[PDB]
Symmetry: C3
Subunit: 115 residues, 3 copies
């Protein structure tokens, strides 16, 4: 099981899960998150390369990907990374990468509610 190392971020309450994967898997990934009860997410189309350099490389070799950013509590990181990795997986190069980033604060605009 995926175990994310958050030890260099003691006291951080919230993390951002940034998942970049094949565009055709977006509905699967979203269904898996919806079923788990995910409390929100943001989707952006991006382009990129990993270790294999696309397709040296140039802009023409960058490959279309879908990105999701999912801010979750610390306690939910591993579960959510695991769900997104499992849903996005095919077993071939280019299946994606997940970056976990620390978040200092969350503020709901409608209410001014923080934390």
């Amino acid at each position: 099981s995926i175990q994310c190392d958050l030890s260099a971020f003691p006291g951080v309450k919230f993390f951002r899960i940034e998942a970049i994967f094949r565009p055709w898997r977006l509905p699967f990934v979203i269904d898996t998150l919806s079923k788990y009860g995910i409390r929100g997410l943001t989707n952006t189309p991006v382009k990129g390369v990993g270790v294999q350099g696309g397709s040296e490389f140039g802009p023409s070799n960058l490959v279309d990907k879908e990105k999701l950013d999912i801010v979750v509590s610390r306690a939910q990181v591993d579960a959510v990374v695991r769900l997104v990795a499992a849903s996005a997986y095919t077993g071939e190069i280019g299946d994606g990468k997940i970056f976990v980033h620390p978040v200092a604060e969350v503020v709901r605009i409608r209410t001014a509610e923080t934390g």
Copy 2:
């Protein structure tokens, strides 16, 4: 709004990322520009919050994102500015996230 940055001692810069209704973008940008905040970066995005949209990809709602990097001391004020201008009073107004930043470099004058 008070922002808890105690977990990041010694961090000098933060990124304020606001995701909000597209129609409020000109209001948010005007309020920030008038207050003297620069370096705004805008990306259109699609999303859901706690109510699960308008769930599947067709329930994702268009939103506008604005990212601004400020110093630690400026976070609370800039967060408040953004919140006040994005506000409408209805669910779906948006969220603001604050993120630590290690370093800032201006390309035109990089050493």
Copy 3:
């Protein structure tokens, strides 16, 4: 010499550069030739009765690297995205907690 000392223990960092779109091919070429192991591109807009505003297209690169590579990569990006006129953009360095490769479940490294 990027000051990463408020991030003890953090292994990976994200280099985020926002710059003129016409410089994209050259930035990519430079990083490719130098041997970069990954990047992500996003188009974004800079913000240049309501006051007079203008949205200006820019290109964004996010490049996650190990600590040791941060200064070299920042230097190459700065040099390739430079024109010397006002409006060249900015580079930020952000801490990253974890990196997971989906195909393999491999983390870290």
